[PDB]
């Protein structure tokens, strides 16, 4: 539910002395931490974050002792992220002129995360390290550090200015130490858990997606009146909308409670009489006349059904259920009931039978008592890991539109010639978005659109952030990376340059 | 590569107009024929109205089908199917796989 | 609405055999 993240940083003088082109680690670290804080604040997952720095002039830690545990400062404690952290990161954090042992930073962070985690149920505890590993240090307490890390089940993560994991001996020794630490904490899998600054910048440039949790829907799949299988349904695919809506506030005082919206009803007479909300009724239109139909009368005459019904109306061949007829705004994934072996066996048997016979189930679905019944299709979906039914709504008789369109093949004036067909074939061949893997096993997708985050939320978050930090400046333009991710690889365009020219030459398109 | 279970919205129908741009019908027919021959669908970015975020959609060609009485039941054109985004998908609880005897 | 009578009549004893094969004599659905 919640996680505690103690971000360790190095604020020594070593990074400041670097080639300007390399974009010295100070600015990269500030950028990555700023993006991380932005993602955390704009995605409210209730995660606590604290900031610790080692290599600064000042000293402020719970433990002082002797010369050790010095030049280390805990700037922020475990608390919910807020814009004040971003403001402090932007300017309040400045480089120092001292050096410190990152081992001391690690012990300080362990002390902080152990002392301030009391009274809160945190299932995760990640400690991130940001340093150049170019500061002289001595190794004399790694045994106890590893023991504490293992006992407390604290995950460790590292970032360095280099990808490997052209460096000095001190950097090599630091790399050896970090690699040994990761091998001890996790092992072979932990070697790759060291991420360069640029690689992190690559993956943290996009705001976190809106992750809603679907509540399980228990019901019973019934075939007749004697067979019943306990099932649980979840919402797999649906259109996602913003969780927070815009609130209208008075322009001057900027307060919600200063505005009140209300509606009134007045007659159509010349005098414009006033009619109260208790002096009106609901009605409908029947041709050229109007028939009153009160709400109580409608409820009395309303169609009444028994809610929570998942009944198999029948079984039909998959070829008779076309994809173009799918309706609704949801897709349901139906699994067996949790902790139920008999239900799982029955559902697996039904799914396997349907798959073998190439059949689907036409069924009736109703969410609850006050939900309109629906007729839908459930079809099997078998994977190496799990198998489940997939339910999608189907149209009624009233939902079908009978439109007649002129034929194109038989049209005499709309018949393309051989050259046009050849050019279109060339265009299609050049603009292929799927590539065969050396004609060996299968295809591979060049432009998968399912993994692209929705640009609407990204733009909204960007503009909200820009207004929050810069109340006076106007909104910025759309970021370039959004456009890049919303467009295909440049190779497709490069290949299609010439076929498109041929299409333009052959086809005489004119606007009227 | 188009998943039948990746349903997000009802599909639409795209048909040449031949009233705003002349010659569009020939190109549309050629595209339909070639797509049917090569079994491909045209991926596109769709923006219905002004001030609306774009959506990634796919155009699947449709082949004219007539009944015994020569009555249209499937008009020729393109079927516009909406493709879900990354956030449009929801994670599922992990369930152990229980098999069934033949 | 499913035709429960017709489905019951068509499935003479298949449901009973399926229940015996799958459901042990202790399982209670809808409970």
């Amino acid at each position: 539910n919640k996680a505690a993240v103690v971000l360790c940083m190095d604020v020594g003088f070593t990074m400041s002395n670097s080639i300007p082109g390399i974009e010295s680690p100070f600015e990269q670290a500030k950028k990555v931490i700023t993006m991380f804080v932005q993602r955390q604040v704009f995605a409210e997952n209730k995660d606590e974050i604290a900031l610790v720095l080692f290599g600064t002039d000042g000293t402020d830690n719970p433990l002082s002792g002797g010369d050790q545990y010095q030049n280390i400062t805990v700037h922020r404690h475990l608390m919910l992220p807020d814009f004040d952290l971003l403001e402090d990161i932007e300017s309040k954090i400045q480089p120092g002129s001292q050096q410190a042992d990152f081992l001391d930073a690690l012990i300080v962070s362990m002390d902080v995360i152990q002392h301030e985690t009391i009274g809160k149920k945190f299932e995760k505890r990640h400690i991130e390290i940001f340093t150049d590993l170019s500061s002289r240090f001595s190794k004399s307490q790694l045994d106890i550090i590893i023991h504490s890390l293992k006992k407390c089940d604290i995950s460790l993560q590292f970032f360095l200015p280099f990808s490997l994991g052209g460096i000095t001996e001190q950097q090599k020794e630091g790399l050896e130490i970090v690699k040994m630490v990761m091998i001890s904490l996790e092992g072979e899998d932990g070697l790759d858990e060291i991420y360069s600054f640029s690689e992190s910048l690559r993956k943290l440039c996009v705001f976190k997606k809106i992750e809603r949790h679907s509540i399980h829907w228990p019901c019973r799949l019934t075939i007749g009146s004697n067979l019943s299988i306990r099932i649980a349904a979840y919402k797999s695919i649906l259109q996602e909308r913003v969780k927070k809506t815009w609130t209208v506030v008075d322009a001057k005082t900027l307060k919600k409670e200063d505005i009140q919206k209300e509606t009134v009803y007045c007659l159509n007479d010349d005098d414009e009489t006033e009619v109260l909300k208790e002096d009106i009724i609901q009605g409908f239109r029947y041709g050229s006349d109007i028939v009153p139909f009160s709400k109580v009368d409608e409820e009395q005459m309303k169609y009444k059904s028994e809610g929570k019904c998942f009944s198999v109306l029948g079984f039909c061949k998959s070829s008779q259920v076309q994809r173009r007829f799918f309706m609704g705004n949801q897709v349901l994934k139906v699994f067996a009931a949790r902790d139920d072996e008999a239900a799982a066996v029955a559902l697996s048997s039904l799914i396997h039978a349907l798959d073998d016979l190439d059949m689907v189930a036409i069924v009736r679905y109703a969410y609850d008592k006050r939900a309109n019944p629906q007729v839908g299709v459930a079809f099997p979906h078998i994977k190496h890991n799990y198998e489940c039914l997939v339910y999608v709504q189907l149209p009624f008789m009233e939902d079908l539109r009978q439109y007649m369109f002129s034929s194109l093949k038989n049209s005499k004036k709309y018949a393309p010639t051989e050259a046009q067909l050849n050019a279109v074939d060339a265009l299609i061949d050049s603009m292929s978005l799927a590539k065969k893997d050396e004609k060996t096993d299968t295809l591979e997708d060049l432009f998968p659109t399912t993994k692209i985050p929705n640009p609407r939320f990204q733009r909204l978050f960007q503009c909200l952030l820009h207004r929050a930090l810069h109340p006076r400046e106007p909104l910025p333009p759309i970021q370039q990376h959004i456009w890049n991710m919303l467009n295909p690889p440049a190779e497709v365009t490069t290949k299609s340059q010439i076929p498109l020219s041929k299409i333009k030459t052959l086809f005489p398109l004119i606007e009227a | 590569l188009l998943k039948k279970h990746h349903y997000l919205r009802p599909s639409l129908f795209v048909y040449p107009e031949e009233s705003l741009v002349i010659g569009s019908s020939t190109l549309f027919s050629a595209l339909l024929i070639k797509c049917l021959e090569k079994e491909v669908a045209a991926l596109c970015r769709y923006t219905p109205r002004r001030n609306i975020p774009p959506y990634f959609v796919a155009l699947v060609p449709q082949e004219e089908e007539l009944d015994d009485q020569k009555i249209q039941v499937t008009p020729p054109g393109f079927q516009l199917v909406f493709l879900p985004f990354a956030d449009d998908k929801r994670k599922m609880p992990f369930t152990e796989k229980i098999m069934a005897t033949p | 609405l499913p035709k429960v009578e017709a489905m019951n009549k068509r499935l003479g004893s298949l449901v009973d055999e399926f229940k015996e094969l799958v459901y042990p004599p202790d399982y209670n659905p809808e409970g």
Binding site: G314 | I71 | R10
Partner: peptide, 24 residues
């Protein structure tokens, strides 16, 4: 044209709904 409805010209006549009818 064959199958044209006699109430609303220009629209195909819809066959009455038969629900589910099990085959032999």
């Amino acid at each position: 044209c064959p199958g044209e409805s006699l109430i609303n010209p220009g629209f195909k006549s819809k066959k009455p709904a038969g629900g589910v009818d099990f085959d032999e």
